[PDB]
Structure formats: structure tokens, C-alpha cells
Amino acid sequence: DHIKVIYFNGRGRAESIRMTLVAAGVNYEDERISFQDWPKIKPTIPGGRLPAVKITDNHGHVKWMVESLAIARYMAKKHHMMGGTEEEYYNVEKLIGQAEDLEHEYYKTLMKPEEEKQKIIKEILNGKVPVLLDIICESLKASTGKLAVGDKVTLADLVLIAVIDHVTDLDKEFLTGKYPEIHKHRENLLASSPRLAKYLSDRA
């Protein structure tokens, strides 16, 4: 099976799919679509929206998968990253749901002129952003291990690092000297997964 990840932004919705495969040691091909070629590639993608993943087997037959975090939960489930008990599965989904609520505040600043972006940025940062960072911080304090859920990598860890990178894109000092548990989660995750540290280091 040849796996191609089709997307437009480098650290958008497809990052959860790339990090789940990286952590699993699963190889894939990146295919980035420019704004310029989207009008003619759109009708070719089932449902007309990115990211999408095209899986071509040895005989050339193609399977398509859409909806970014439904693709990431399927890949994570196949590689034992959706928890190891039903209880662990609830805690993985709990943090995923918390991170996605923070990502939704970040999306409100996107593809806007650089004056309205500034206005929306100062509202969320004094708004729902610190509220949701505190809820995620408390969730991390409840884990029975050093990562988000227990002590082994799950999809919850990778969605969290992706969303925290979006917050620091809005204001790079936002977390300086605050939310130690978030900071610590990142150090712990990169130590549990050499592949992800290599991926991230290298992406930087």
C-alpha cells in the first residue's frame, strides 16, 4: 500500500495524520496542492475538500479516505494509539475534544486581512484560549502516566502538540512561564517517541 497525504497547508488539519504515521513508523508521500492548482484538482477529490488520503495498493487499486481526524483515529486505532482499555479510550477522546475546541478559536483568525486577524487574535487570547489551556492543563494532571493518557503515545498527545503550536503562532510568548504541565507534556512526548522528535526537529 502506497499512502499519499493530500493537503494544502504545512501545519493545518493534515498534521494529525502525518504525526500518527510518523509515530507508527509508517511511510507516506506528502502531496501539497497550491492555491493555483486547486480549481482543477478539486473535482478529482471525493467530497471536494482537503486533506484527503489516497491509498494505492500493489495492483493500482485506489481507496480514498477523507475527514482528517476520522483518518487519524483509524490509523491510530490500527497502531494501538487510541488507548488500551475503554476507560483510556474515553480519556483519549476527552483530550481530543478539548484540543479541538481550542483549534476552533485559532481557526477564527485564519485567512483574514492582517488588521482583522489582529482584532480576532486579541479577542480569543483574552477569551476562550486561556480557559481551554487551563482545562487541558488539568486534564494532563489527571493522567495515570507522563503523557496525556497513561504513559504511552496516543492520538491525544499529537493533537495537543499541533494545537499548542497554533496558539504560539498567534502570540509566541503566550505560554512563556505559565502552564508548566503543557511544557512538560511536550518534553515527555519527544522523549517517548524519537521518531516524532526527529520529525519535528527536522520540520523546524
Q: Which residues bind a copy of itself (CB under 8 A)?
A: 46-49, 65-71, 73-74, 77-78, 86-87, 89-90, 93-94, 96-98, 104, 135, 138
Kindly write out the interface string for residues 85-114 of this chain, putting x where it contacts ligand GSH by CB under 6 A and - elsewhere.
------------x---x-------------
Helix (H, G, I), strand (E, B) or coil at 82: coil
Interacting span for ligand GSH (CB under 6 A) from 19-27, 49-57, 84-92, 185-193: 49-57
- Residue closer to ligand GSH by CB (options 21, 193) is 21
139 binds ligand GSH (CB under 6 A): no
CA 109 to centroid of chain Cα atoms: 18
48 binds ligand GSH (CB under 6 A): yes
- Residue closer to a copy of itself by CB (options 182, 190) is 182
Helix, strand, coil tally for the chain in percent (to 5): 55, 10, 35
Alpha-carbon dihedral 72, 27, 11, 154, rounded to 10 degrees: 40
User: How many angstroms separate the CA atoms of 83 and 89, rounded?
Assistant: 5
Classify residue 145 as left (phi > 0), alpha (psi -120 to 50) or beta: beta
In the complex, the residues that contact ligand GSH under the rule CB under 6 A are: 12-13, 42, 48-51, 67-68, 97, 101
